[PDB]
Amino acid sequence: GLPTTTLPGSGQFLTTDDRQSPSALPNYEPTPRIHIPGKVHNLLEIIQVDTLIPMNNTHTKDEVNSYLIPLNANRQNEQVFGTNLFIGDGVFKTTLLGEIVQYYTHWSGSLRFSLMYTGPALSSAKLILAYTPPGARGPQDRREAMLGTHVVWDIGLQSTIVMTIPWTSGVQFRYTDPDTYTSAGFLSCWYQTSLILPPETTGQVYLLSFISACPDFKLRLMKDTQTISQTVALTE
Amino acid sequence: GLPTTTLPGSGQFLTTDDRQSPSALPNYEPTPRIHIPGKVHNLLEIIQVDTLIPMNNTH
Amino acid sequence: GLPTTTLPGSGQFLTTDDRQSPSALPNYEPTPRIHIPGKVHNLLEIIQVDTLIPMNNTH
Amino acid sequence: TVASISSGPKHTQKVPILTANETGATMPVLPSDSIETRTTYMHFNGSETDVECFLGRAACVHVTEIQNKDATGIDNHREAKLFNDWKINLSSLVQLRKKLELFTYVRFDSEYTILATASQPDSANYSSNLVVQAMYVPPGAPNPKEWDDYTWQSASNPSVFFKVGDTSRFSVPYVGLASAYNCFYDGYSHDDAETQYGITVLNHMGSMAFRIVNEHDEHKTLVKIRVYHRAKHVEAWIPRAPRALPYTSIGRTNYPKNTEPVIKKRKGDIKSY
Amino acid sequence: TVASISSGPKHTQKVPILTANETGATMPVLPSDSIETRTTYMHFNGSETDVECFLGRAACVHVTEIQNKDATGIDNHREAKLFNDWKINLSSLVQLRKKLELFTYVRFDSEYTILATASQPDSANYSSNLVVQAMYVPPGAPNPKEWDDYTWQSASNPSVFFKVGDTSRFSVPYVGLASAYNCFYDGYSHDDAETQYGITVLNHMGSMAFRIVNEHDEHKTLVKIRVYHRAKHVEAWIPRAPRALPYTSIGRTNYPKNTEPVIKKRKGDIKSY
Amino acid sequence: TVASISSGPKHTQKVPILTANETGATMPVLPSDSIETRTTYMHFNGSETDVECFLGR
Amino acid sequence: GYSDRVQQITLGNSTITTQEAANAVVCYAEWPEYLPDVDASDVNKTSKPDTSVCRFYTLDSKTWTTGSKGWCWKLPDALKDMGVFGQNMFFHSLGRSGYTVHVQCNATKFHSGCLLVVVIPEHQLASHEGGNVSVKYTFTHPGERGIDLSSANEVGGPVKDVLYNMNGTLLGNLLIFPHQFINLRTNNTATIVIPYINSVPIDSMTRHNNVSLMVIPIAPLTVPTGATPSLPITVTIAPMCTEFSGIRSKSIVPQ
Amino acid sequence: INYYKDAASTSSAGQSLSMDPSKFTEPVKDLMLKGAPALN
Amino acid sequence: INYYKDAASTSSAGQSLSMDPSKFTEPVKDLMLKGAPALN
Amino acid sequence: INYYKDAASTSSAGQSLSMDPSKFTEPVKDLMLKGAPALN
């Protein structure tokens, strides 16, 4: 008989501990694995695939239309859309990125925001996208917007433009749940010159917008998502 | 005295676990084995012998 | 199963003991350290800096 | 590892930021393709986002309850909770369910922890000490009918006996019939016109059965069982869109009617911040 | 190591005891610069004044309380202490606080011990055996609303279940967002005219939540939770003046008005012994 | 270990499927003696049918 | 002078040419291949009709109009009646296959509109009834007709709400599945190569569909002034590396 | 590691991995070859 | 040290440290180079 | 022997045995020698 002493914590059950256990089914042989395409190893692998952002959130019931950012022909100087960058809330929240970020407490890294244009091929347009780093207000006019991170996008044969929100930060991690100290800025978009439709054409054209994370990205300290809850256990 | 911590499951009895136990009969000597024809090792050995099927179940 | 005996003191919590514990946050990666001037290692380092004595205590 | 390299002004014919998303790719664009950057290192590995880590902590998967009371004159033990049962599965309580259904096929060993606590809602002199016996009843094996049937002998079926207030823990290998468990299944068990659709049809491994071994004392004792499940040795294939609407049933994808808009409406314009 | 060397009479032009304190230095003067000494050795290392040792013992950081009782008809579990909560921090009880605030920035892993004891202030037949469940709820994660919400499933959030009367112990890595925790912060969360000032703004890691897993017995049971915290792997920068006045609030430096003189007045003259 | 070997058409004078059960033997006939098979491996050892396992709980 | 843009796919006795492609997607970066022995279980030699089943079948055409919500086809169902592919299907106990899907929609440089073409492995549909109502067989086996998401709820059928993918997930996140867009201004076809994806090495072709192909208008069709307000969309699909096993009597399936 | 002195006290035995059905499936005195006629 | 005989009874697995998003982010048939035109 | 995988779970650290008060006691820009005049 070897002398032992038990410490504080004996008998506790910590849902996060990782130890060995007896197998209830001694000697059982599991089914062989066969090959299946698509294996995922890290959630970091999947948040780099871009998905659509319901940017046009202004509706009243969920609709395919809140994915469409409208553009008006012949407007000059004006603003196309605006949003803050609380990736865990608001427009971002239902996107795959938003949806995964919510399983973690802290995030750090660059984001990739792209816009794909869908107007007739014989039209043309020049837009400016601007990222405003924390510390200033959402820009109120392009002059204000153009003094921060921006890209003049020229609509052409190449249909999409990929803007990166480079990680601009004092503190090396931010909260995924919106927090002030930890806030990330604003994203706005304005006409640089203006949309022009060809003859025989009319109305609004739309941009689709996507979001995905750069390879830069870090997420840490897992927790429970506000995105799902329940009141009684389900049954069959 | 070596410091320990006990985990969840301590004291449980799992009918399928396989561990050592003290022998109640210390030092006892079992009867020698003699040879007996017919030893079975796997149930897989015996399910290969065919047996009759009551196919005509209608009684 | 290895035979053990527990000694007096089992289960006690001594605020001054120093042992290992399971991490509640398995696999979490702490923020990198950056350099900060001023690191203290011993209280003996700081009690050698002189400070003023309110000698005139009479107020 | 560098998180960003140093990059300076650019005036090229080589534009990495113009792409064609119609192709289905997400081109790997970085901050340094469109602003001037400085070197910085990652200092991070992505350890805690590994799927083994993501699915590897215990989650509550089931809460049931049984009572110890005089069975004298009870015509239906099962019905008196003289020993309940659970048609095993992992998608009754939803926190863990949304996590698993981020994948289509999943393969893992399970580690179960079972916590049992007792309640004595009406006048008792004391708290008795009950031993629970929770045995695994696969498909094609007698289910117990009374709380003390021959079934409980469990001569071939793994069973664990632990005390109420304590916890029991053991681990079961991956018992799936195929190479992975389906998280989803767009099929039937056969081409029947009325057979059920979905995964309740593949997913079946019979039910787990609990009872108190103790005979009855003078008062009644409620024992409530909580089963926790931790995946170990995880393998996951084919990521899918996360669950947006609430769940209604074990094993079907169905969402409730007149549900509410899941996308938050802006308080303001598209232009609003 | 010598604590003092041998030194004899001196009649020099080299005076180590005259200095200019206006410079900000504390010149390293020793007994042997001004009296005749003999050799003596230190016999000591300064082991127990290491900051790891100074901050490394468990200190009580929080006492809360929850009760097990029939929740039937309770409109606000939180309010009935059917399961309390603690907005985590380390500066409510002050013994440990004064110790930490001897430094400006501090970095360490935490080891928590949680002791839970039960009380039955009014007539009970017995002492029941309750299991506590204390789960960690970070910022941006549902807080439980009832004592038995889906939240308690805690499928992704670390939770520990232990018995009242026992102790639970686990250790959490340094969870700060920056490189160190600030002990002090002369800033705001943004340039707002009315935002709060101080460190309550950086310092936030959501709250810890406790509940009893047991349903109710016939009597009521008070369970009082004490959280102890031990720093391990300590790193401290920039020493500061010790706290002289009493504390009034978590996270602000504020002292109470009409406080009392903190320097003891002489009973006698400056000349008094 | 192969569970089945590959086997193709047969037109022989050597018929493994005709036997005389009166002898008391169970002749070891396989799928590949009477249909055309493809190779497949066992992936299994028969561990949990060992008598030690069968009587050992 | 090779462009990403022009392409030719020849499979069997049938060829497709596109002069306005946008590359092609190969699901999960894997190309269809036959079933290796190491992965095999059924001992039966399989049948590989090759060129008689691995050719291009063009399903009947759809009409995109300003009110369209989107269409959904299931595989192998959509092909249950195409030539010898279909016969083989009803006649063997088990079968396995990959596909090349080519979705076609041309317009002019004055039109606008953008379709999402996506392949979803194991697309288990939801009942519009809620609760645990099932979706009857016939409803998930529309055949070449596919399911029309702008048709009305029917009884025993699936829900046809587009912002929810017919299963409780948001349209916006379908992009995690192999997919390609058809943006009239860029593109005129979409091509996806689908490797066989299952948790078993071979399965039944009638009780289980292993992918749904979905074509969904996202930016509404907008025709030039006084143009007819609609465009046809055509889907052509070719089984590739098909294998059938366990031949017999010929399945009889509901309805 | 055995902690105990007696052999009965050790854990379960380990798989025969013996397996030879012929004592049960082919106990015939003159050997039968599959493919050759049963009765000559 | 494993104390138990079966593999299911061992603790959690250890980090894939595999990580290759290209099956998801770039499943295109003809390789796309960043910087070169998307559609030629 | 660490029984646990993560570094936070190990016991207390071990004595700096670093000790250098000069950053606090003599942060002067031009070095002062004891015995030499303070102000020259």
Ligand SMILES: Cc1cc(CCCCCCCOc2ccc(C3=N[C@@H](C)CO3)cc2Cl)on1
């Ligand atoms: C005593 C005792 C009691 C027991 C029970 C052993 C475990 C039996 C159940 C096997 C695990 O079952 C599942 C595994 C995975 C999934 C699963 N559902 C999908 C979403 C994905 O995975 C479901 C079940 Cl029921 O063993 N010994």
Ligand SMILES: Cc1cc(CCCCCCCOc2ccc(C3=N[C@@H](C)CO3)cc2Cl)on1
């Ligand atoms: C179950 C379970 C429960 C838990 C909780 C884990 C610990 C969470 C809290 C993290 C530590 O928080 C702090 C560390 C340092 C300081 C600090 N304040 C300044 C004076 C200095 O340091 C404050 C807090 Cl709240 O984890 N698993």
